[model samples]
Structures are given as C-alpha cells and as structure tokens.
Target: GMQNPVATVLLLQGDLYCSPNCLATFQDQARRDSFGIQSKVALKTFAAADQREAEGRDLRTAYNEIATDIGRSQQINENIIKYPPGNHVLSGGLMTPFHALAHGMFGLGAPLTFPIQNVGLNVDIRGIPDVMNVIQSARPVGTSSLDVNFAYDVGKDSNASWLTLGNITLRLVGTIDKNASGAWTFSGEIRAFNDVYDANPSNHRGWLGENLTSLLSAVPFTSYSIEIPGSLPVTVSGN
Candidate 1:
C-alpha cells in the first residue's frame, strides 16, 4: 500500500522603509554590492534601444522589443533562481511600478525640494496547496502559488504625499520541474494591482503636489492589472 503524502508550507513577512535619501542610497548600495553587474545590464539594454532608434526604427516598437528581450535574458532567469521558492521574482514588465514611483517622486531631470518624505514597503508571502503537493510528490504536477501583497506609502512628513498607493499586490502562480539532468526549472506568471489615492491637503499650494495629484487622479481608472503574455522560466541548480 502507498503511504499518505505529507505537505509543507512556507511563510515570509517583512517591512522596509526609505526616508529622504534612503531609497536612493539603497539603490546605490545594491549596484555596488552586485559589482555594478545589474547597472551594466541596464546600460546595455538602453544602448540597444538607442541603436534601434538610430537605425530609424519606431521608438515604441524598439522599446517593446527590448523589454521582451530583457524578460527572456539569462541574467534575469539566474537571479530568479538564486532566491528560494515563495520569494517573488521581479522580472519582465512587472518591475515598472517601482521605477515609475521612484521617477515620479524624485523627478526625472531635476530634483524636488521636498523630494519624497518617505517610502514604506510591507510584504507577505506564502505557499499554496499546489506547492505543498510538489513537496510531497517530489515531482512537478499542478501549479504552485505565491501570493505577495505590498503597501507603498510616500510623504514628506507624517502626512502622506499627494499620491499614495495601497493594497499593491503581486500574485504569482507556476509549476516547478526537474529536467533529465536534475536541474530544477520554474515557469510562472505574475499579476499586479494597486489602489491609488490622493493625499493632498485642501490648502495644497505647490506646483509639484498639484501636478502629482492630477496625474494620480487619472491613473486609477486606467488598467492596473498586468497579465504576462507567456510563462517566465528560471533555472535553479542544487550543487
């Protein structure tokens, strides 16, 4: 007779805050710690876009192609594999939210006087039933699940900024399989959403704040859900 299967679950929770220059400093440290490998990849990717534009290609088309290429790059796949299961992998177009919020708060070309008051992040991750099955069977079967929910708050003081986001959620569902040579592979899809809010005071009297308020007001009705067109693959090696 076959034995009953045992299931396993993993849970993770954490919080991080970036005040004033903290976010900027964190980004700098991340680059330096990685020996600027990520930074070089970003530069090379941008150069590809520039080359495409120089060749008289449509900028939008070039951008789309380049983004697709990055999503399929070996570097991203390797980084995804480096992390343990239940850790959300930032890849493909899913990275846009972080970059967008940073740019909006810090400005593109010029720095704002107030800059960002502070940014806070809260994350929760857990494994679902399908994942437990994988652990029990020791073979790829149904899709595993990882649900990540994050909240981002921005402001100068205790008061929140003109544009604040809450309930920013990223849900990943996928399967894990081992190849004939025993290399583990993960294939998954990521979906994201957030609730945008206007935190401006009634007496708000600044150009920057007003502009942010207007932009955020118009963003909610727009699409926040992103459906990855194809499965993202990552290779995990147990050596």
Candidate 2:
C-alpha cells in the first residue's frame, strides 16, 4: 500500500507523554547510572524529557527528571531551524511579497545572515548549525537532508538530549516546522539525528577502566543496533 504523507503526518500529531508503562521504564532507566551495551540496543531510546536537555547539560540527568504529564508535545520546538523573511518556510515561500514587506515594516533587526537567504553572512540560527557537525561525526555523510535541515533559524545555546548508550551517545536535535493548527510537524526521511558515540561513556578508555568496558563492547555479534524510530525532530516513543 502506498503510504500517504498526509495520513502519516496526521498520526504524528499529539502531545508526547509517558504512558504508565513508558514512565515506569523511563524512571527505571534513569535510576541507574549504567547499563549493558546490549541494554543500549534494546532500551536507551526513552521518551519524555526535561527542558535542561536543550541546554547541552548532563545526559542521563536530562531524562532523569522527566515528567510523565503531557507537557511535552511532539512538534517543533526551540531546536529547529526556522525558515525566514519572517521565520517560517510559509512566511518566505508562501507569502513572498507580504513577507518581504513585513520585514521592512518591522525595521528588521540583526541583519541576521540566514544560510538559505544567506542573511548578514552570519549565524542566523544559533544552535542548529553546529548540530550538523554532530550528525557528520557519528554517521556517514549524505545521511541528512541538509538542504532543508540546515536551511533555517534559534536559541541562547545549542541544546540536545544525550543518551550515552554503550558504544554510542545518540543525539536528538528538535528540528520542526510550526503552525497554528495541527500542521506544526516534523516530517522527513530522517527528521533530525546524529550520534556522539565517541564520547559514549561506555566507550571510554585508559584512566577510567575504559580498557575493560570498551573491550566488553568489542565482541562481535553482541552489539546492539541503534534503532532509530520515527524520523527524529526529537520524536521519542516506546515502552
């Protein structure tokens, strides 16, 4: 059956929260400071997050304090690249003329250099671009939809949720497109993801018994495949 993008996106609309089962798992996972490499493959991809994750703070602690309420919606947040002229693809592409006029009417500030529009020849969106580097580090190139991914605008500093699961530290950057209606969506082949597996605590060596733990993961056929669920944009769902 052909998958309708419309139907697919519609199913994505919802405020993400932990189920009794999911919250149970999240809390349980958070309680432990460590887990097996195989545990990383089976678990690790937890749902529900706190605001601190976006600030590039501690990894486990981010999910550690997660709430079970529906406070976290599955839509674009501060981490996404906002399209411009006036901050959205619709703004620039849909209402090109009005968007331009609106920009002028507002006495536009910053003279920001957005990459797509190439504004200010400067950093248009703050934290988003650097994440592309994150994407490149773990996975091979051409894994991301760069034209759309790095094309737009955001925040005081780069914020991401880090899950140091064994040989990898999965990084989720909340890339999204917003709207007044349910159209605020994150739809793409690979929403927004990258791996910081190098710093994966389990992969550490030398001074910290990195040799032993790192060796633990070296056995072939024992590695957990990092299963990426629905296209990223920070979409976390599972038991």
Candidate 3:
C-alpha cells in the first residue's frame, strides 16, 4: 500500500512599517528580526501647496518615517492584506510615519535618520506539520526560508481602487536544509511591485507647485521578484 501524501502549511500575520527600499535591501536581517512587513499597505494621495515639488516632498517625508522608527506608527491609508498558505511572518517598522510630519515642517533639508526596530518573527514556521518538532530538537528551525509574492486587481469603489502610492507584496517560501556543520540553505523569492515613475516636471511633480529639485516619483512597478539563493545568515544558526 502507498503512504499518504500530505503537505504542511503555516500562516502568520502582522504589520511592518519601513521604507520600501530598506525592506528590499536587508530582507534577510528583517526576516530574522521581524522589523519590516506590515499588514496594511502604505498609500496616500497628496495635494501640496506646491505641485511641482509635492510628490517629492511627500515621498521623502514618508520614506523618512519608515526608515527611522522601522515602521512603528506608520499609516498606509486604510487597507489590510491576508497572507496565503505556507509559513507567513509579519512585522512593522516606525520610520515612515515620522517622515511625513518632518517633511511638513522641514522640506528637502530634513535630516536623515536611520533606526532599525527588530520585532522578530510574528509567525515562525520552523518545521512543517509539527513546527514544535523543529522547536523541540532545535535542529530544523523553519521548514522554509520565506516566500514573498505581490499581486494587484482593479477596483470599483474608493476602497477597491488600487492606490498607485504603495502596492508591493512580499512572500516567503521553500524548505530548510542544513549541512553537517549545521549550516542552513533556503530557496524562494520575494516578489514586489517595481514600477518606475518619471522624475521630470513634464511627467509628475511634487505635492505643492514647487518644482522638485532632487526628489523623483517612480511606481514600484507591477511586480518584482528576488530569489533566495541559499540558507543565508541562518541556515545553521540556532533559531
């Protein structure tokens, strides 16, 4: 007789606040620490006194807030996302929120502050079926490294409308493998929106009419994918 064919799935949910770039940059660090990954997507429409520089100024402020506190109290309009099957880990930062306030006060000359908030993992899926098993032996910490995927659909009402501001998605997938030395190996991809917005005045300006000098506007695109090569900084580390 054949054995039963089964697969295990884990779902974790939480919120994270931080600059999109930052999150994309140190993904490994963020995943282990849980500093980046929010339940709500950041989206905002601004009407600045100076249209020329409104977008740039507003974006700078927003990015600053996300980067500083690591997404502690950042607001992404009003919307919530539900994760798919598999090990889902969610987290939020606190820099983005402050950036908004600061930009309103200072402008382009606003000082740059980078602070990383390590919330860790909201949903840790060390092993499949029996995540406790991995926790028990302390051998296989997580079943898979992390798979992040992003998607968007057109909407009708305001709520349904897909805000162009922020609509990127991050997913974690793949199994965990360790070598004799206890080194780790991970595989999967973190897909996101990678649209490129124009920075020139003829294209899109800032909130106010003030022509943006250094600032620029670019959509995260439709989708962006990052392949997880191997068990990075944690394939063997004691999770």
Candidate 4:
C-alpha cells in the first residue's frame, strides 16, 4: 500500500514547570549553614502524526496511547538526607528560553549558526529586496515541505511531586507552497518517556544538573508541511 504523502506530517506541543524561587534561596542559605536538602521537578511534551485533514481523530488517539504508557511507568523518588543540619536546601526550575537561545548560539549542532549567503546586494540590509535576495540565495525557489517539533515542560525543581512531572515530544512535518496562500500545514508523530533521578544526598549538584536533566527530558523532535493556500483559505484544525 502506498503511504499517503500528506500522512507523513507530525504535530508537536509541550509544557514545563519547576521548583519555586524561594526554595532556591533557602537552599543556598542551607549550603552556607552546612545543611543538605534534595528536591526535584519534571516536564513533558507530546507529538502526533496524521493525514493533513484527518488530524484531530488520529492525533488524539495517538496522544492517548502515549499518555497511557506514562501513567504506567514506574515512579522513582527516594528521600534524601540532610547532614550537619544547618539550613537544608532545595531548588526550583530554571527559566528555559534564554538557555535554548544560548545553546543555539554556542552548543554543538546550533541551528542559529547557519551561514548567510549573498545573491544580490541592496542599499538596506533589512529592506524587502535585500531580505528576498538573501533568502533566495540560501535555497532554490520552489514549494517544499518541512517538519518541526514543539515541546514544553515544568522545570525540574526540588520539592516537586513526581507524579505531576512528565516527559514527551511531538513530531511535525508538512509542506510549504511558495506562491499561493502563503501558509504551511503539517502533521507528524508523538513519543513520551520518563527519567530517573537517583543521586546520593552528598552528591547532589546545583539546580543546573536537575534543570539540564529536565531540559533534555523534554527536547522536541518536529516535522512540518508548508504551502501557499488556494483562493479559499483551507482551514485544517486548531482554530
């Protein structure tokens, strides 16, 4: 059976949260006072694949399956000890967008580092002419499809309920038409999973470690479909 080209698209969504800031401050004080505290938080993302027009039904079913697995996964949380009790400490989740941007700037495989090229020179770099010339230089002028993944999660934090924490990702892939309605519609896959945090109380690192772990847990994998709309705006879903 031929696989429908349109069915290859994937959709993505995410949400995340973390520990309270006050807890972080208290933890800092505890460290200075020779006390130890342990805490954790979690986040999750989801994705689903389906035919362009046949999304809601298929995507919902897929999401349900993914959620089921997560519900069944074993929970892993162990109480941590505080030694030399002075002021015990814990942490809240870290803000994320800034970190992602930094990664785009410096981390390996940073997408923001794609090279700029020259096809034509215009008086103003930000002008339409200049922008078009630069864009055209990067690739051929044609209709193409793409895939993107979106994800979200609560940041990792100490004192977080393990049950409230989740991890997942959505895959979105779609087509792009360069000339018509100037819009793109896509669909893709969904995958969800969990992580285990088990470090000795003395070995607990700062929030950075848990924060990074939370980040990695919710990383997205996406695909997209973009195209110009026809005379009548074709509405697919998510109105």
- Whichever of 1 and 4 has more lDDT, that candidate is 1
Q: Is 2 or 3 the stronger prediction by TM-score?
A: 2
Which prediction has the highest lDDT against the true structure? 1
- TM-score for candidate 1: 0.23
After superposition, candidate 1 runs with Cα above 4 Å error: 1-167, 179-183, 198-239
Per-model TM-score, in order, reads: 0.23, 0.20, 0.19, 0.21
* Candidate 4 ranges with C-alpha deviation above 4 Å: 1-20, 32-142, 147-172, 180-239
Local accuracy by lDDT, each model: 0.31, 0.26, 0.26, 0.25
lDDT of 3 by residue, 199-229 (tens): 2322322231222211212212122121112
Q: On residues 1-63, what C-alpha lDDT tens digit does candidate 1 reach at each position?
A: 111110000000001111233234334533453523343233233334433443456534554
Candidate 3 wrongly placed segments (more than 4 Å): 1-145, 148-167, 193-209, 212-239
What's model 4's lDDT at 29? Answer: 29
Q: 1-239 in candidate 2: lDDT tens per residue?
A: 11332222212321221232332342233234243321232121221121122233442343333321112333322222111332211111111211222222221331211112211112323245564443333332222232234432211111111112122222334434433332333223322222222322253333124333443344332111222223323331111
Q: How accurate is candidate 4 locally (lDDT)?
A: 0.25
Question: Which residue ranges in model 2 land beyond 4 Å of their true spot?
Answer: 1-125, 129-190, 193-202, 206-221, 231-239
Q: Which candidate is the best by TM-score?
A: 1
